[PDB]
UniProtKB/Swiss-Prot annotation:
Binding site for [2Fe-2S] cluster: C35, C48, C61
Record protein name field: S-adenosyl-L-methionine-dependent tRNA 4-demethylwyosine synthase
Function: Component of the wyosine derivatives biosynthesis pathway that catalyzes the condensation of N-methylguanine with 2 carbon atoms from pyruvate to form the tricyclic 4-demethylwyosine (imG-14) on guanosine-37 of tRNA(Phe).
Organism annotation: Pyrococcus horikoshii (strain ATCC 700860 / DSM 12428 / JCM 9974 / NBRC 100139 / OT-3)
EC number assigned by the record: 4.1.3.44
Chief location: cytoplasm
Family: Belongs to the TYW1 family.
Keyword Iron-sulfur: yes
Residues the entry annotates as binding [4Fe-4S] cluster: C71, C75, C78
Domain Radical SAM core, residue spans: 54-294
């Protein structure tokens, strides 16, 4: 009988929409949801590509966001129970970091209860005690003013952290850098190689997103933590100008680059084949001096490019894998 403190700072109708999609709301503006993946992992011994790529055990990932319904993009491949996001900023009052982490852990368990049957036993126990905080559910998490501190809160309770951002909020990165509160691994999602594609695919709600993204990339160079540039590829929408993507990538010189297939305006044929991704990956690596194709995972049609000076058998800020 777990209970989560909550009082959704949004129209009740919206809040109900999140619930029907199985999100567990936290506080005024956050939420938790079980990895789409996680089910088959607990019941079928399934693995995730993040495990193959970085040594991350997805079944011990607590997937959440401190910015549930606000974002700076209304992207065409962005799932959100409602029509468009509610706005470009996190409305106040803002919940504090410790409360968010605590309640999120309770939310995670509450959702887990919906299990135990055909379920693995030792694994369920580990999912009940997550060690990876995936800050990438929905919305634009960097809109939360206290990201740095949120990261520390997770770290104090032994989690390693992973932030996924669309990069339109460089000031939050400058702040985390300044107060030295960086996550274990930082991902910036890039879905457009040029300004026109950026508008038609991301559908910006702010006017200066492109320059903010350019700044974000520049702030990632030599960043003292694990870095990733993730490209979500949509057939017929953004799989072009690989040389332009390389330039964006090069401004940040991330440790890793993921060429990932995208899997509302978007048809089922907008989904590229794994073979399409391999091709795009090859075309891309050709424009990235000092990088090479390091691995792939066909089941998720994703290919991994890694910077040459990163050790394929190491861990940490200079190795392929997360500290054991």
């Amino acid at each position: 009988k777990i209970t989560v403190q909550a009082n959704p700072n949004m129209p009740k109708e919206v809040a109900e929409l999140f619930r029907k999609q199985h999100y567990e709301i936290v506080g005024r503006h956050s939420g938790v949801k079980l990895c789409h993946w996680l089910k088959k992992s607990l019941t079928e011994g399934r693995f995730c590509y993040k495990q193959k790529f970085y040594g991350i055990h997805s079944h011990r990932c607590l997937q959440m966001t401190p910015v549930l319904a606000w974002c700076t993009h209304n992207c065409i491949f962005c799932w959100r129970p409602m029509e468009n996001f509610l706005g470009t900023e996190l409305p106040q009052p803002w919940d504090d970091p410790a409360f968010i982490v605590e309640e999120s852990i309770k939310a995670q368990r509450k959702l887990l209860i919906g299990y135990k049957p055909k379920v693995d036993k030792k694994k369920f126990e580990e999912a009940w005690n997550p060690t990876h905080a995936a800050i990438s559910l929905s919305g634009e998490p960097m809109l939360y003013p206290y990201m740095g501190d949120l990261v520390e809160e997770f770290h104090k309770r032994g989690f390693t952290t992973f932030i996924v951002t669309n990069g339109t909020i460089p000031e939050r990165l400058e702040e985390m850098i300044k107060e030295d509160k960086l996550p274990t691994q930082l991902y910036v999602s890039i879905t457009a190689p040029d300004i026109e594609t950026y508008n038609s695919v991301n559908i910006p709600m702010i006017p200066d997103g492109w320059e903010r993204i350019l700044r974000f990339l520049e702030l990632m160079r030599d960043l003292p933590t694990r870095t990733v540039v993730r490209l979500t590829l949509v057939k017929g929408e953004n799989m072009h100008s690989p040389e332009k993507y390389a330039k964006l990538i090069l401004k940040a010189r991330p440790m890793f680059v993921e060429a990932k297939a995208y899997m509302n305006r978007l048809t089922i044929n907008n989904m590229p084949s794994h073979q399409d991704i391999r091709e795009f990956a090859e075309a891309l690596v050709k424009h990235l001096p000092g990088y090479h194709i390091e691995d792939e995972y066909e089941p998720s049609r994703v290919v991994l490019i890694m910077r040459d000076d990163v050790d394929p058998q190491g861990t940490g800020v200079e190795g392929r894998f997360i500290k054991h």
